[PDB]
Structure 1
Amino acid sequence: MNQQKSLTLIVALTTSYGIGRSNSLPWKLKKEISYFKRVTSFVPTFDSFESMNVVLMGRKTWESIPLQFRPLKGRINVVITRNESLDLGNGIHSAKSLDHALELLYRTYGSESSVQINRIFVIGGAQLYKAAMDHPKLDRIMATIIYKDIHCDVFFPLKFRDKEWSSVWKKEKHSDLESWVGTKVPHGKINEDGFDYEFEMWTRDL
């Protein structure tokens, strides 16, 4: 009814859990943003026919996307705002909260719809990340660890890779990361423009 499917969170963060600065990402990573686009766009071949993915984001995050890349193509976009004066879109939804968005999609993309939902992604920001970390359906984190203590003013809200959360959140093998995204992905450290980063997949039991 409200939430059938599992939620997946996607984030790029430093080893200090830093995620943004001055309403923007503090780094310019071309191969990294390409990975974001692949993961969030990927739907299996067979299901290719009707299925689409959803990207859920906080308003400040909506605002932070280059006018040029917005709305995010090939994906159903939904902005979470407790205050919707309006929304500047042409098939882009607004919802009051995370659950309100799930009900909107399940009502909007039912049987009368040509367009079916494949995967649901929470793309941030910190406020939305916090609500998703508390949601009983969030069981997967697609994280990119940036090994550089970049000055940030916004932080990921839960230290999921830390000892204290280690009996709940588990890092999965690289091969099932690849299997989940479909394409093979670079293993180990990637160096792009002075930054060292790596792709990880973390899961938890519901």
Structure 2
Amino acid sequence: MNQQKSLTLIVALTTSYGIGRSNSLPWKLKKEISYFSRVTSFVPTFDSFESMNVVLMGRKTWESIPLQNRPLKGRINVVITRNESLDLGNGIHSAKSLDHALELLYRTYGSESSVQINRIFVIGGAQLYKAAMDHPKLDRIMATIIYKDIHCDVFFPLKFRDKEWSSVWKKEKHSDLESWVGTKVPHGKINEDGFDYEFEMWTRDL
């Protein structure tokens, strides 16, 4: 009683699949973070009476977030680590794998509980992204494509926008991005502190 919900991956990456620098983001793009926050937080009106989304993230990503911004507010946060240690935790769930997270989530927020899960997002680590791309339930990438070869030292693990992956991964119409996301979303290049970036949505049949 586990594999009912698909997973969505959300990432901002350069054209050379760069995602990370010295354990942080290699840009500072306030509107891109606003998009990330709205997408990961958005629940249909009828359902936000008790439903919330889930953000699953790697322990190095969790450590990368400024303390003022943990746990990611208004979403259920779950940190994936092989080391059942202590992320001294507000209510900070921890699991040793992406499947252990889902089990913990379905156990914790059951069809009877006061808080109910709406959508489930994987928000990073390269290492956690790698696990997600291998997961049979993952069917959607909310990608922010950043059009600058920004120097990075951590890379998204699977070239999903490249030719070799084009039979599996398909980029959806911008109107299809909107209603999945449930809001008007800028179409085309956005410019914030020197780079062009744009919002994309890719899917892969289960």
Q: TM-score range by the shorter chain?
A: over 0.9
Separation in structure 2 between the aligned mates of residue 84 and residue 153 of structure 1, nearest angstrom: 27
Shift of 1:2: 2.5
Query: Which whole-Å CA distance do the structure 1 matches of 2:105 and 2:21 have between them?
Result: 31
- Does the CA-based 8 Å contact 1:78-1:92 persist in structure 2? yes
1:68 Cα offset (Å): 0.6
Assess if the C-alpha contact under 8 Å between 1:3 and 1:103 holds in 2: no
Structure 1 residues not aligned, in runs of 5+: none
Instruction: Note the C-alpha offset of 1:101.
Output: 0.3
Three-state SS of the structure 2 residue aligned to 1:49 is coil
In 2, Cα distance between the equivalents of 1:144 and 1:63? 22
Structure 2 CA distance, aligned partners of 1:88 and 1:28?
27
Name the TM-score, length of structure 2 as normaliser: 0.99
Deviates more, 1:22-31 or 1:82-91: 82-91
3-state DSSP class of the match of 2:69?
coil
By how many angstroms is 1:111 displaced? 3.2
**CA distance in structure 1 between the partners assigned to 2:94 and 2:6 by the alignment:** 20
The whole-number CA distance in structure 2 between the counterparts of 1:53 and 1:203 is 19
SS of the residue 1:68 aligns to: helix
Give the secondary-structure state (helix, strand or coil) at the position aligned to 2:8.
strand
Counting matched residue pairs gives 206
**Which string of whole-angstrom CA distances, capped at 9 and with x for unpartnered residues, describes residues 166-197 of structure 1?**
00000000001001111100000000010100
How far apart are the structure 2 equivalents of 1:62 and 1:203? 26
SS state of the match for residue 37, structure 1?
helix
Moved more, 111-120 or 94-103: 111-120
CA shift digits 1:75-116 (9 cap, x unpaired): 000000010211211212000100000000000010341000
SS where residue 196 of structure 1 aligns?
A: strand
Distance 1:174 1:2 in 2: 31
Output the CA distance in 2 between the equivalents of 1:64 and 1:90: 17
Q: Render the CA deviation track for 1:16-38: whole Å, top value 9, x for unaligned.
A: 00000110100000000000000
| Equivalent residue, structure 1, for 2:70 | 70
Alignment TM-score, normalising by the size of structure 1: 0.99
The separation in 2 between residues aligned to 1:68 and 1:29, in whole angstroms, is 17
Moved over 3 A (4+): none
Residue 29, structure 1, aligned to residue 29, structure 2: yes
CA distance in 1, matches of 2:2, 2:111: 16
Query: Once the 2 structures are TM-superposed, how far is the Cα of residue 11 of structure 1 from its aligned partner?
Result: 0.1
Deviates more, 1:105-114 or 1:115-124: 105-114
SS at the partner of 1:9? strand
Where structure 2 has 5 or more consecutive residues not aligned to the other structure, the ranges are: none
| 1:79 corresponding residue in structure 2 | 79
Q: Does 1:162 align with 2:166?
A: no
Q: Secondary structure at the match of 1:78?
A: strand
The answer to whether the 8 A contact 1:15-1:146 is kept is yes
